[PDB]
Amino acid sequence: FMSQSNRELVVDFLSYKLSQKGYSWSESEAVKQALREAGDEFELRYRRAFSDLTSQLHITPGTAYQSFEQVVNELFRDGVNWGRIVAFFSFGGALCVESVDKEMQVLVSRIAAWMATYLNDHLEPWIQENGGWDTFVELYGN
Ligand SMILES: CN1CCN(CCCNC(=O)c2c(-c3ccccc3)c(-c3ccc(Cl)cc3)cn2CC[C@H](O)CO)CC1
């Protein structure tokens, strides 16, 4: 029952990041805007780490899930917090841009699904217990 809303948040963020990197293909608005702003701030703060990610990934359709699962499990190893959720969205965004750059566009819809499933199954309980997305908007939005 949460599947569609979590999918909408993931697709809004990924569409935004792909557009920001030059690819125009293929309140809920307050949450989407706060996440876009948080993702931008995160990328500007950790630009070096994105460069290290884009140079060590060697993304292929066969390894993309293994890479996704490895990084996401490491990110949340010590538990969840809002900063790690922002890193999770940012990582997904970076993986999608890298997939399109390497002519592996087929991975974009796959990564969106892996992100929505992880948000649904592992992050949603923490999100609700820590004030919901309205709390996130207060801490990261405007
Ligand atoms: C020696 N270590 C000292 C401390 N650091 C590791 C622990 C903190 N970093 C992470 O957990 C982390 C982040 C991340 C998380 C938040 C901020 C910055 C980086 C990302 C990440 C990469 C790309 C994008 Cl786009 C987004 C996130 C991946 N990881 C885990 C994979 C990494 O190889 C470590 O195991 C650096 C090396």
Side-chain angles (χ1 to χ4, degrees), residues 6-25 27-54 57-111:
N6 284 335
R7 167 156 191 90
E8 283 172 12
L9 200 45
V10 167
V11 174
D12 178 84
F13 186 86
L14 297 178
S15 175
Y16 174 71
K17 285 288 154 177
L18 283 161
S19 182
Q20 184 177 78
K21 295 308 186 264
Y23 301 123
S24 68
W25 275 357
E27 180 67 78
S28 184
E29 288 306 303
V31 178
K32 289 171 183 174
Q33 191 50 229
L35 193 52
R36 288 178 181 199
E37 289 167 2
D40 286 347
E41 292 295 322
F42 182 91
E43 185 166 345
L44 289 161
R45 179 169 284 174
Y46 301 109
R47 199 240 302 145
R48 280 173 288 243
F50 279 69
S51 79
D52 297 337
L53 180 73
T54 220
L57 262 169
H58 306 274
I59 194 156
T60 66
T63 62
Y65 182 72
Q66 291 155 202
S67 292
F68 176 86
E69 188 179 49
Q70 186 173 182
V71 170
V72 169
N73 291 338
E74 185 67 28
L75 179 57
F76 292 111
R77 174 53 180 80
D78 290 328
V80 187
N81 64 39
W82 295 115
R84 290 159 187 161
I85 290 176
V86 175
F88 162 83
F89 276 91
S90 295
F91 170 62
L95 259 195
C96 285
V97 173
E98 181 69 9
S99 295
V100 183
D101 283 356
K102 284 189 73 182
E103 301 179 81
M104 289 163 198
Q105 304 98 295
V106 65
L107 294 177
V108 174
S109 67
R110 299 186 188 171
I111 294 159

